[PDB]
Design an enzyme around this catalytic site. Sequence first.
Site, PDB file in Angstrom:
ATOM      1  N   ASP A  17       0.790  -1.229   0.000  1.00 36.92           N
ATOM      2  CA  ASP A  17       0.000   0.000   0.000  1.00 36.92           C
ATOM      3  C   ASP A  17       0.827   1.287   0.000  1.00 36.92           C
ATOM      4  O   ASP A  17       0.300   2.367   0.223  1.00 36.92           O
ATOM      5  CB  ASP A  17      -0.950   0.004   1.199  1.00 36.92           C
ATOM      6  CG  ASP A  17      -2.316  -0.537   0.865  1.00 36.92           C
ATOM      7  OD1 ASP A  17      -2.519  -0.949  -0.293  1.00 36.92           O
ATOM      8  OD2 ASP A  17      -3.190  -0.537   1.766  1.00 36.92           O
ATOM      9  N   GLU A 113      -3.444  -5.741   0.551  1.00 36.92           N
ATOM     10  CA  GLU A 113      -3.891  -6.089  -0.800  1.00 36.92           C
ATOM     11  C   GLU A 113      -4.860  -7.267  -0.833  1.00 36.92           C
ATOM     12  O   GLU A 113      -5.086  -7.852  -1.893  1.00 36.92           O
ATOM     13  CB  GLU A 113      -2.682  -6.479  -1.658  1.00 36.92           C
ATOM     14  CG  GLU A 113      -1.463  -5.619  -1.461  1.00 36.92           C
ATOM     15  CD  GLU A 113      -1.325  -4.594  -2.548  1.00 36.92           C
ATOM     16  OE1 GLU A 113      -2.267  -3.800  -2.731  1.00 36.92           O
ATOM     17  OE2 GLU A 113      -0.283  -4.590  -3.232  1.00 36.92           O
TER      18      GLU A 113
END
EC number: 3.1.-.-
Length: 183
Positions: A17, A113
Site C-alpha cells: 500500500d 492487498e
Amino acid sequence: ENVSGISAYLLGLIIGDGGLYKLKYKGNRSEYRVVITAKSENLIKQHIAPLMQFLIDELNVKSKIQIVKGDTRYELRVSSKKLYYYFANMLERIRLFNMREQIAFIKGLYVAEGDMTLKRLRIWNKNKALLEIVSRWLNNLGVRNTIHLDDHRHGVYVLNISLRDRIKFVHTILSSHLNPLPP
DNA sequence: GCCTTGCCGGGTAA
DNA sequence: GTTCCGGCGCG
DNA sequence: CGCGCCGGAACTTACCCGGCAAGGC
Ligand SMILES: [Mn+2]
Ligand SMILES: [Mn+2]
C-alpha cells in the site's frame, strides 16, 4: 525477534500500500522516503504509526513520522536515508525470511492487498514473482493456493487461497499472536 | 442443490 | 501509489 | 556547493469488491 517481526509486517504494508522512494530534486537535492498510504486517518495514527515509531526508535533513526492529508488518502511518511535502505535491503533478501518474518510479511501484505471480507481469500498484485514467493511459503504452511491473471485490463494477478484451508490460513497467518495483530 | 473458484467490470483507495 | 513543488540544515 | 529532512498535494491506475456461472461433489 520482536524487531524482525514488526519490520516484516511493515514491509508488507509498504510493498502493498505504499513504497520506497529515492527522489532527486533541483538542485542536487535528494530525499529518501518510506511510505504507507491508507483511506482511514485512524488506522494510520492508531495501528501503523506506533509500530513504525517503535522501529524508528530501535534503529536510532532520527527522522519523524509525518502524516499528510491528500485528496484521496492519508500518507504515513518517514523521510530517512537509513530507514529507506533498511527496508530496500530487507526486500532484496526476502527469499531468506525465517518463519516469523514470512508470517508477518504475509499478514501485512494481506491487510494491504487482500480480500478484507474474508468471504474469499485473495491477494492482488501486478508482481507475479512476489506472489509466487508467497505461494511457496503458503504451501510450506499447508495452505493450498493458486495464482491466475485476474484483471486482464491492467495485468493484475491474484493469489487465490483455497477455502478448503480457510481455517488453517486465518488462524495461522491473520490471527497470529506472534506478530503485530491485523485490524 | 450447495460450494468453490476462474473470470469479469466499476471506480476509488491507493 | 508516485513524483513534482518550495522550504530548511549542515559540513 | 552538494546533499538529505520537512510539508504539501496533483496526477493516473492497480487494486479490492462483489456478480456470474462452469464445474465439482
Ligand atoms: Mn499495491
Ligand atoms: Mn489497501
